[PDB]
Amino acid sequence: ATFVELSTKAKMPIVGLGTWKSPPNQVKEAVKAAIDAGYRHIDCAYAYCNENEVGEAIQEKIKEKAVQREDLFIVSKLWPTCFEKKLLKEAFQKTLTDLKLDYLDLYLIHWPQGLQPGKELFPKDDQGRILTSKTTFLEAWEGMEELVDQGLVKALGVSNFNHFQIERLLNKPGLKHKPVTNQVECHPYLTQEKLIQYCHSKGISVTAYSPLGSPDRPSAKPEDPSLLEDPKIKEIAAKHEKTSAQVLIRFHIQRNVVVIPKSVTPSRIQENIQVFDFQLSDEEMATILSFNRNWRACLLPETVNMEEYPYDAEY
Ligand SMILES: NC(=O)C1=CN([C@@H]2O[C@H](COP(=O)(O)OP(=O)(O)OC[C@H]3O[C@@H](n4cnc5c(N)ncnc54)[C@H](OP(=O)(O)O)[C@@H]3O)[C@@H](O)[C@H]2O)C=CC1
Numbered sequence: 001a002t003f004v005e006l007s008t009k010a011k012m013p014i015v016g017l018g019t020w021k022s023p024p025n026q027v028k029e030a031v032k033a034a035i036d037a038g039y040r041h042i043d044c045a046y047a048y049c050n051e052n053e054v055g056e057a058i059q060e061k062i063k064e065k066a067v068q069r070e071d072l073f074i075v076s077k078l079w080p081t082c083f084e085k086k087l088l089k090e091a092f093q094k095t096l097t098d099l100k101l102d103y104l105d106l107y108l109i110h111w112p113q114g115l116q117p118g119k120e121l122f123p124k125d126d127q128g129r130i131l132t133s134k135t136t137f138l139e140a141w142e143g144m145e146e147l148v149d150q151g152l153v154k155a156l157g158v159s160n161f162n163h164f165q166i167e168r169l170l171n172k173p174g175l176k177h178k179p180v181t182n183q184v185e186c187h188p189y190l191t192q193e194k195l196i197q198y199c200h201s202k203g204i205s206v207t208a209y210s211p212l213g214s215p216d217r218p219s220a221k222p223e224d225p226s227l228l229e230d231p232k233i234k235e236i237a238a239k240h241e242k243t244s245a246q247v248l249i250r251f252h253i254q255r256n257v258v259v260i261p262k263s264v265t266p267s268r269i270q271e272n273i274q275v276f277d278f279q280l281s282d283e284e285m286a287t288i289l290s291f292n293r294n295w296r297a298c299l300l301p302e303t304v305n306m307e308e309y310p311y312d313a314e315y
């Protein structure tokens with residue numbers, strides 16, 4: 001299907017356009033090319049430093065009458081340096097006014113660990129240690145619930161949360177709006193079977209990020225795992241006359257998981273959403289699921305000892 005039904009009954013387009021690393025100079029035309037290619041969901045974030053330009057694109061396509069606002073599903077996230085309530089309101093406003101929108105369809109806690117407030121996204125002492133803060137995501141959640149009550153955000157969600165962190169949120173006393181999504185890394189080398197089963201059991205959808213392995217991530221060592229070059233994935237793509245990137249995106253669609261490939265190249269943006277005219281067989285899905293390597297593409301070793309570091313839990 002072309003969407004994943006959320007618990008609120010809102011339909012989240014299953015293929016969205018990722019924007020991390022897209023330069024401010026190139027993201028406006030890339031979002032316009034994606035909307036022309038049928039994309040109706042754009043993943044954004046205050047931390048990506050390009051929301052203003054993404055806003056310019058949406059505003060132009062709505063002004064040109066190519067689509068209405070309700071046809072789109074815009075997602076942004078709250079960076080952990082802004083969990084405190086006063087800072088949360090200021091950050092959300094910066095994200096909403098940069099995007100030039102009346103409301104967001106989905107706002108997510110970006111990472112579960114609160115970081116020191118300030119101008120930097122990664123505050124650090126002199127020895128390179130990333131500075132944390134004690135304000136939790138539960139406190140930040142209350143500020144986010146207010147935005148929903150103010151009609152500025154339709155729904156809330158979390159990102160990079162393990163099941164213990166989602167349980168704390170679902171068990172929060174006085175919880176007013178449940179999370180409708182948990183955005184995490186997911187691809188054939190990190191299949192997330194237990195986390196996806198847990199989220200679906202709670203009525204929480206999952207959005208898979210870095211579906212192509214994030215080849216353009218900072219400091220990627222060329223010898224690390226390459227999903228786009230894996231011959232085993234190329235073989236299955238050839239059986240369907242599709243590319244490896246199209247198989248990597250169709251994989252999530254067949255698990256009822258939203259996926260958000262990133263690209264500032266119009267031909268690839270088109271190629272990445274031409275995944276609705278074929279289906280991976282049951283045997284092909286089992287083979288791809290067997291490629292799991294519990295491999296995450298972008299790690300920060302300085303975050304491993306943090307209190308909310310999310311990767312060492314079972315799921
Ligand atoms: N919540 C979180 O913590 C995180 C969320 N995300 C989100 O997920 C999105 C996607 O993940 P991301 O890490 O960016 O990496 P992706 O796995 O989407 O890969 C992006 C890279 O793949 C290239 N590419 C895209 N399509 C193709 C294709 N068909 N063939 C070959 N190369 C292709 C792009 O090149 P080019 O652009 O030049 O076309 C770019 O270099 C992010 O942009 C962001 O929105 C990502 C990480 C973390």
Ligand SMILES: O=C(O)Cc1nn(Cc2nc3cc(C(F)(F)F)ccc3s2)c(=O)c2ccccc12
Nearest residue numbers: 020047111112113298299300303306308309310
């Ligand atoms: O954030 C994006 O969307 C992409 C993203 N991912 N990563 C890897 C990260 N790993 C983390 C781990 C924690 C932790 F919670 F574990 F502490 C906290 C924060 C991070 S950022 C980055 O290093 C990064 C830097 C700038 C802009 C975007 C990103």
